[PDB]
Design a protein around this nucleic acid. Structure first.
Ligand SMILES: NC(=O)c1ccc[n+]([C@@H]2O[C@H](COP(=O)([O-])OP(=O)(O)OC[C@H]3O[C@@H](n4cnc5c(N)ncnc54)[C@H](O)[C@@H]3O)[C@@H](O)[C@H]2O)c1
Ligand code: FES
Ligand SMILES: [K+]
Ligand SMILES: [Mg+2]
Ligand SMILES: [Mg+2]
Ligand SMILES: [Mg+2]
Ligand SMILES: [Mg+2]
Ligand SMILES: [Mg+2]
Ligand SMILES: [Mg+2]
Ligand SMILES: [Mg+2]
Ligand SMILES: [Mg+2]
Ligand SMILES: [Mg+2]
Lengths: 70, 108, 96, 46, 161, 86
RNA sequence: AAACUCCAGUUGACACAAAAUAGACUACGAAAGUGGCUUUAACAUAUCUGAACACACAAUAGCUAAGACCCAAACUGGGAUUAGAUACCCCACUAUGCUUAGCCCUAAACCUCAACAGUUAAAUCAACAAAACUGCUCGCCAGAACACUACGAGCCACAGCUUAAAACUCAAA
């Protein structure tokens, strides 16, 4: 069997785990910003729906839940 | 179903042994058992020293109680056998006779 | 032709070999029998290459021995000395 | 056949009436389950 | 409801003179002195007598449905006490799926027997879903909003007209 | 601990032959597997290693018995040549 | 050498840990797994196939709460060795291995053989592995690396898991 392929998989994985450790803090900020933008996009899509329907505002009693914040 | 209770009782005199046997059979009947027969295997030295109810036993009386009881009774009986101070060790098994003696054609 | 061979099961087929306990009931209370398959010095259960028993009866003997040992009928670390003079059925010799 | 056998067997079962006598008789009895086997496959009763 | 514990075993119910025996024999040959399997057999026999046209024919689809229903009830009773028995949970789910398949076949072949089976065993036949897709948070919230918006649109249209 | 003493793994000496009694006891303990069990229990053997070892010994024994059977079966032909010259 | 000397030997009492021998057996379970004893429940389907996502499960490791703690032991100290030892050897002791209620969903999770049905006739047949094939169905694959990666989406997971590319490069792999 290909032992080079498994050793290449090991080196690639080990190198990757070093990168995430080094940049763990920068990654967290990127992820939280991405989640914020994704929530904003979801809200915009919902607003698009109730605007196209005809309603000038959201359905009575409706509050867009935060479905991505941990 | 049909069960066999193997009872290792304390080495006592005849009156206390009779009283303990009567109490055990009475508990069996109270839990709904139909007792078929009571066998005495004898008073003998235990294969090993057994510690029960803060007492050490090297000798004991061996008895067998064959009976028919509902499935729910067995657990209860076990707990009762745990409380009786004159019982060194009680064990309920499915009666060996109910086990079927399948026949063999020999070594293939 | 009347002399042609006829289809038939082997009439000379010898009866298939039996273990010494075949057809007999193994009970956990029969400590005398269960003691014939344990080491006199350590109480260890002999394997089938020593006892000569079949797989089914080997399993039956093992289960009966364990049940008797745990229920206070048979010693574990040695064979009961009362059964040391019973017939020897195991193929083992300590030159003792 | 099984029902008839059970019916005749029940006559010897222990009840609340014969418990004293049966316990006493069992105390004055001894049952032996021990028997050995030989290399020829024969049972040796004690 | 379970059969009363005094009921005789399935194999000891047609024996001649079984009513002319002692009470102890009756207790010994009853469900009280037997495992749960004999009691399940008595349920199966009762359901067969109550539902199927020929109670002796165990080869019909209805008879198999009755037997699997008894088995499913047994599995559910086991799992009420044994919550962490994953193997028996698997067995229950598999038996439910098999009974659904048999019920579909019975409906496709014999609708009258299908109705009798559904009424007798208390089974509420359900049609399978058309699509199998995850209902994640985004989809669920979006669908709820869409339903609400449709309701408000209907109200506004009613007010206009 | 809870058993009677001087019954298990006990050998009596005959005519003051203590060395013979010790060697008999050693034979008994080795035959019953106690010696190898004690030696193997000094360090923990991993379950996978235990399974591999057991399979290896079982197959080794089977192969050795089969080879011994073959050699014994073919040993009959090892006699003086009856057709020497031709 | 450290360590202990509230140490060591016999005897007696004494687990929420682990389950010699049997087992040279090859069984149960869908797989993962399952080898001390008793008892109660209990191991789907009288066509077959049928899912990364549906419904259920999934070794070891790991994360939350509480509890138990003999032994073992990442980590952490001490002793020794070494040019150095942030390792190997010795001692001690944690997380963890255990129970309860939730998660996490990964393995060389492999018999490295997809499920059912059928054949032993043909040149048997690249090679090796494990004799060679046929019918039918689902899943998957179309040079290497980039890449068990990036982005998107989903997830009780937040240094995580599933799915999973492209650009540049090469004549190989
Ligand atoms: N997508 C469905 O809901 C659906 C409904 C009926 C039948 N099927 C059949 O399932 C097969 C697979 O279809 P696909 O490639 O587009 O799915 P897919 O594998 O590409 O996944 C997309 C969706 O289809 C579902 N899916 C996947 N396999 C399925 C199956 N066997 N049955 C039902 N749903 C399945 C998944 O849950 C997922 O939500 C097709 O033969 C299709 O005819 C699919
Ligand atoms: S050979 Fe028949 S039971 Fe062992
Ligand atoms: K493998
Ligand atoms: Mg299927
Ligand atoms: Mg698909
Ligand atoms: Mg897991
Ligand atoms: Mg854990
Ligand atoms: Mg595995
Ligand atoms: Mg498949
Ligand atoms: Mg598939
Ligand atoms: Mg490629
Ligand atoms: Mg990834």
């Amino acid at each position: 069997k290909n032992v080079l392929k498994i050793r290449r998989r090991k080196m690639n994985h080990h190198k990757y785990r070093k990168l995430v450790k080094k940049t763990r803090f920068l990654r967290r900020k990127v992820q939280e910003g991405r989640l914020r933008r994704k929530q904003i996009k979801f809200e915009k899509d919902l607003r698009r729906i109730w605007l196209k329907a005809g309603l000038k505002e959201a359905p009575e009693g409706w509050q867009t839940p935060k479905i991505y914040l941990r | 179903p049909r069960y066999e209770l193997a009872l290792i009782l304390k080495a006592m005199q005849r009156p206390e042994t009779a009283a303990t046997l009567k109490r055990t059979i009475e508990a069996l009947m109270d839990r709904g058992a139909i007792v078929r027969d009571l066998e005495n295997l004898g008073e003998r030295a235990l294969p090993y020293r057994i510690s029960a109810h803060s007492q050490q036993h090297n000798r004991g009386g061996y008895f067998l109680v064959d009976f028919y009881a509902p499935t729910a009774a067995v657990e209860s009986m076990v707990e009762h056998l745990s409380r009786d101070i004159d019982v060194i060790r009680g064990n309920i098994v499915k009666h060996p006779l109910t086990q079927e003696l399948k026949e063999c054609e020999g070594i293939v | 032709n009347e002399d042609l061979p006829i289809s038939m099961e082997n009439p000379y087929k010898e009866p298939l070999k039996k273990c010494i306990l075949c057809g007999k009931h193994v009970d956990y209370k029969n400590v005398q029998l269960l003691s014939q398959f344990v080491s006199p010095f350590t109480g260890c259960i002999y394997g089938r290459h020593i006892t000569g028993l079949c797989g089914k009866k080997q399993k039956e003997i093992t289960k009966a021995i364990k049940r008797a040992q745990i229920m206070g009928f048979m010693p574990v670390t040695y064979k009961d000395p009362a059964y040391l003079k019973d017939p020897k059925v195991c193929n083992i010799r300590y030159r003792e | 056949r099984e029902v008839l056998q059970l019916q005749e067997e029940v006559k010897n079962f222990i009840t609340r009436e014969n418990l004293e006598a049966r316990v006493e008789a069992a105390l004055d009895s001894r049952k032996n389950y021990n028997w050995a086997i030989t290399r020829e496959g024969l049972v040796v009763r004690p | 409801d379970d059969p009363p514990p005094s009921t005789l075993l399935k194999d000891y119910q047609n024996v001649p003179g079984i009513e002319k025996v002692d009470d102890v024999v009756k207790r010994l040959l009853s469900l009280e002195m037997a495992n749960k399997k004999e009691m399940l057999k008595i349920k199966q026999e009762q359901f067969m007598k109550k539902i199927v046209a020929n109670p002796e024919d165990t080869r019909s689809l209805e008879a198999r449905i009755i037997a699997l229903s008894v088995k499913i009830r047994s599995y559910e009773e086991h799992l009420e006490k044994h919550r962490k028995d994953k193997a028996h949970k698997r067995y229950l789910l598999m038996s439910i799926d098999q009974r659904k398949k048999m019920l579909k076949n019975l409906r496709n072949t014999n609708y009258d027997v299908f109705e009798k089976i559904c009424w007798g065993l208390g089974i509420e036949y359900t049609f399978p879903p058309l699509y199998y897709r995850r209902a994640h948070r985004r989809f669920v919230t979006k669908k709820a909003l869409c339903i609400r918006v449709f309701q408000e649109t209907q109200k506004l249209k009613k007010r206009r007209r | 601990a809870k058993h009677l003493k001087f019954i298990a793994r006990t050998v009596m000496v005959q005519e003051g032959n203590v060395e013979s009694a010790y060697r008999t006891l050693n034979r008994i303990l080795t035959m019953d597997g106690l010696i190898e069990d004690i030696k193997h229990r000094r360090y923990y053997e991993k379950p996978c290693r235990r399974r591999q070892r057991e399979s290896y010994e079982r197959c080794r024994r089977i192969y050795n018995m089969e080879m011994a059977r073959k050699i014994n079966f073919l040993m009959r032909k090892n006699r003086a040549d009856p057709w020497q010259g031709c």
